[PDB]
């Protein structure tokens, strides 16, 4: 039919199936409905199949790309309105350890990774000198090489952007609890989480409400279920900046 | 960071931010100043939006200095989109920055639709946030634009009004369905709408007969010296003059009363008050006369052949007012010969129509123009009372009878009329005494009924104290300029329908251009600032001091002595 | 308050889950103030209460309730609101000039200014002479009637009878004699009655006692039966109507029964429009009393209990003693003091509360707020507060829209609530002037409007 006529029709189904809110069907659900719909009509070969595992495979704790949902209303609705969705802020940001989990590959160049950087600490850490409870986000970086990531972490500590890994010196073994000094010490800005080692035990050694942003491209770790996630996959590293 | 400011204190309605650093040194000259908007947040995403009312910037010898903005909130802004009603609790400390250009638009641009946004002015303290009302509830609801001389009152009631009748949607070339009329006292609007029909005497032609009899009853007639006897026959002369002037079945004529206003001619009505004064009773009390055509009695069917001047009384004794009708016959003879009431007691008044003086009116003549402005300057002040209150009565029941038909009709199309007050104490004043009484209810009729029937009102003055209050407080949008008489102050304060943050110190420093808008049409009681109007309104005035410093002129006045002689 | 005396319309504003009952009879047996500014939903407030009263059926039936409401409309928003009602604007609405009492009948036709005790004692006896010959029933009452009762009388007579009185004419025994078809007479009590037809030549040498000082009077008097904006207060049809038709109308009584009247005085004029609504003010309160004083020497519990809103109550019952709205002022007073006890209470609704008068205002026990932006109307509220809480009332000025204040008896405790949001809210047709404004000049609709004017 018309592009409007269906789009009421197909978030219905989806809607009383599994009893979820608004954003947790039509921005969730519908959403990854539609690829794997396109994903079985471009097959070659194997054009129709058979629905009954597609239910399960739309249900994942990610939200994929939409491609044609980004070539239609551009970048700055699309983003915008994965924003709006999950990213629900509030005028008092609680201190919660917020855990940033961003996909980093060779394609990105190291600038425009800082600027997300710079973007996610400013909205998301209240280091003010009269805050009883200061907080800071937490930065995790994975698929690239370590020779990339010690010159993104360079990079920052010259720009005056102190921040701890849980290697407080050369040849450390992992404190992570210098993360969570680090998260109530307001002259530190982020939390550098190294790989995806040091993050697990990081979860161990903190008792207050944490959330995990994940902000993907092609690969997405697992991360544990109990933990309240937003797995947002984008094109290009750079489209994290508008969401976050 | 250029600003770095934080709250330090929260109450119920109010903000304590703390400036820290001011590196920036301009921020706090145009962003950080009284009045001006302050986001409060910890993210770039959901931001409090607070109003500055106050700021004390302590310095010290030792110390820091102590940059302390007291602020309110007003509202809640969530990725881009204004919420009113500010009361959500932000707990400090949280990020203060001055609001981008973004957000304070976005503070009086989404609460107004789209179609309906009426911009004639943008914010006093950001010029680039245009500041809307909204257009349907601007005008339907009266407008009360106050504000002292030297403010540019009449400035701010010009730019309305070219913004109204420049206000055209898609698919003709002009002259769009605006329906605008001033009372313009001063002359000011004479070069401000160069494309409209101004009406001063010379050109204006207002019928005496269109008044009611109270407004005869005050034209023609004196106030005190004025005896019982004497009324009767002002009454008896037009009520029965109306009565053969009319055309129209008898049905109709029996419901014609003295407050009726038809036709009539004034120059009957003194022939009959003259020949009244002349009558002579013979032994039986009865008033035989002669005209031309013979004897006849005078009683209530004879009565009408009293008009003409070449009838001759006969009889024995004095009538029954005779002697007593020569202070009248002299006082309304004083009326219809004098030339600065000839444009409502003239030859052309008689001659006049009453479609014409209403195609005069709201110009449906053969100039069609959206404002119509009747220069009453030259008016006199005993009979400006009576001309406002003929046309204000005149226009009202136009919209009245406008939607007469709308019953039977059932048409879209319809005449919305603006009647525009300016100098609105002179015409309905506080007080209440009998000459301003004509002039009175025909503003407030049109200050209770007026929205219903689509002829609603602007009432412009530099004195607002002497409005009544049963007028001023129809009106539903109130736009305020510097006012700084106190008496003036506090009548409005009390009328007002709102109150942004202090407003006693702010009224006086209120600048040229400076305005206060508040009421329904508007979201939130704002300061704007009016657009400055290219074609201004501008009174021609002698300048004294100019024509005083030159050398003394003796060839003017044997001009001007032939002129009153007319020789 | 109990499971049968909980009027649920609001819920609390800061715990939507709780729901905010008042005590539904002591909510309308005491009188009702519900004030707020102009656009915080004060007439939303207003219908959903009466919205919620009218669907206040008890299981057993499915007809009409017992509900009365009578509704002032001066800007006609409750003819949406209510689509199941009896709407009456000046073109449907008849109320009759005899059924005004004496302080009525002379604000309509004397003059202030002119305060003349001829004008107004030969109005008396114009008046209540008349009413003495148009009844027609149990001749015990025909003696007994004053100026101030309710019965027909002829305007039209009323003014040939003043307008004969002009023409007084005196003999040398101070005698008014006067000539018609049927011979000569005196003017007497027994002869006063013949002056009421305008076929009457007097008989006389000298002036008489009023030769002359009532034609102010007169002139005065055709400009008002004449009106044609008096037409259904003065017209042909308040001369046929009665007053158990009068009656039907105005509480719904008639074929057509409604819970809801709504009285749309919007096409009222203002100079007669405390009058009108003083007349029918009077009519339901002395309605209410004569319903009572049955039942008290009956002892039956079939009951009409009547409310009036009064929207825009500063129009009619201001804080000015001015004598133009001291007819409708009176009104509202008695129904606000003695009112409840006859089952007529009133409902007082405006935009403006400060020139509400204190002597009423004060009268109603439940005190309904919307979002109050006026200092002056701020600081009238507090002074005229029932016992409150510490800072409640501050909250004021900061009303979001449908948040309200209601304290009194009828309520446990002076709270903000949330009124539940109309789902048939009420709209008024507001001639949109940008809309109009912004179309082509008209020029076929000028001279329909100008044809019509001369009647044609």
Known sequence: KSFDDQKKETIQIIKNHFQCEDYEAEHYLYSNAFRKTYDISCNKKDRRIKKSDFVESINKSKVLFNIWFYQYEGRKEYLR??????????????????????????????????????????????????????????????????????????????????????????????????????????????????????????????????????????????????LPQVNIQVKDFADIKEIV | NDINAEVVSVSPNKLKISVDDLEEFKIAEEKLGVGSYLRVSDNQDVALLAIIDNFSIEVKESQKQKYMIEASPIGLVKNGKFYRGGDSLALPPKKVEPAKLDEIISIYSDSIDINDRFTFSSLSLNTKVSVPVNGNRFFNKHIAIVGSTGSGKSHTVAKILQKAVDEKQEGYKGLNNSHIIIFDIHSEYENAFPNSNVLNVDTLTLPYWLLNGDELEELFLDTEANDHNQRNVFRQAITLNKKIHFQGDPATKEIISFHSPYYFDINEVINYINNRNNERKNKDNEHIWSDEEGNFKFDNENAHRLFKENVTPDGSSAGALNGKLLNFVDRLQSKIFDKRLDFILGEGSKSVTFK??????????????????????????????????????????????????????????????????????????????????????????????????????????????????????????????????????????????????????????????????????????????????????????????????????????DKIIEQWSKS
């Open chain 2, 356 to 557: 014409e003086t209403l195609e005069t009116l709201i110009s449906y003549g053969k100039d069609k123009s959206n404002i119509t402005i009747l220069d009453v300057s030259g008016v006199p002040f005993e009979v400006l009372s009576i001309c406002v209150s003929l046309i204000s009565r005149l226009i009202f029941e136009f919209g009245y009878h406008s939607k007469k038909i709308k019953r039977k009709s059932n048409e879209n199309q319809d005449i919305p009329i603006l009647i525009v007050y300016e100098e609105a104490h002179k015409y309905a004043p506080k007080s209440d005494l009998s000459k301003y009484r004509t002039s009175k209810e025909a503003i407030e009729r049109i200050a209770k009924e007026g929205r219903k029937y689509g002829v609603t009102l602007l009432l412009a003055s530099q004195r607002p104290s002497e409005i009544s209050e049963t007028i001023f407080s129809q009106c539903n949008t109130f736009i305020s300029m510097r006012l700084t008489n106190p008496d003036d102050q506090n009548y409005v304060k009390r009328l007002l329908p709102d109150t942004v943050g202090d407003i006693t110190n702010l009224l006086p420093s209120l600048k040229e251009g400076e305005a206060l808008i508040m009421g329904d049409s508007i979201s939130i009681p704002s300061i704007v600032k009016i657009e400055k109007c290219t074609i201004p309104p501008s009174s021609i005035d002698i300048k004294y001091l100019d024509e005083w410093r030159k050398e003394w002129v003796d060839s003017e006045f």
């Open chain 1, 81 to 226: 309105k994965l924003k709006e969705s999950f990213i629900r802020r509030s005028v008092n940001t609680s201190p919660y350890a917020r855990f940033f989990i961003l996909e980093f590959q060779d394609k990105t160049d190291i600038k425009t990774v800082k600027d997300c950087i710079y973007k996610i600490q400013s909205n998301w850490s209240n280091l003010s000198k009269r805050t009883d409870r200061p907080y800071s986000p937490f930065l995790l970086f994975h698929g690239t090489s370590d020779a990339n990531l010690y010159e993104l972490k360079n990079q920052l500590f010259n720009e005056d952007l102190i921040f701890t890994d849980g290697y407080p010196f050369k040849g450390s073994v992992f404190t992570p609890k210098m993360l969570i000094e680090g998260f109530s010490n307001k002259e530190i800005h982020f939390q550098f989480i190294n790989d995806i080692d040091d993050f697990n035990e990081t979860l161990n050694s903190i008792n207050i409400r944490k959330e995990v942003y994940q902000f993907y491209t092609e690969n997405c770790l697992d991360i544990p279920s109990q």
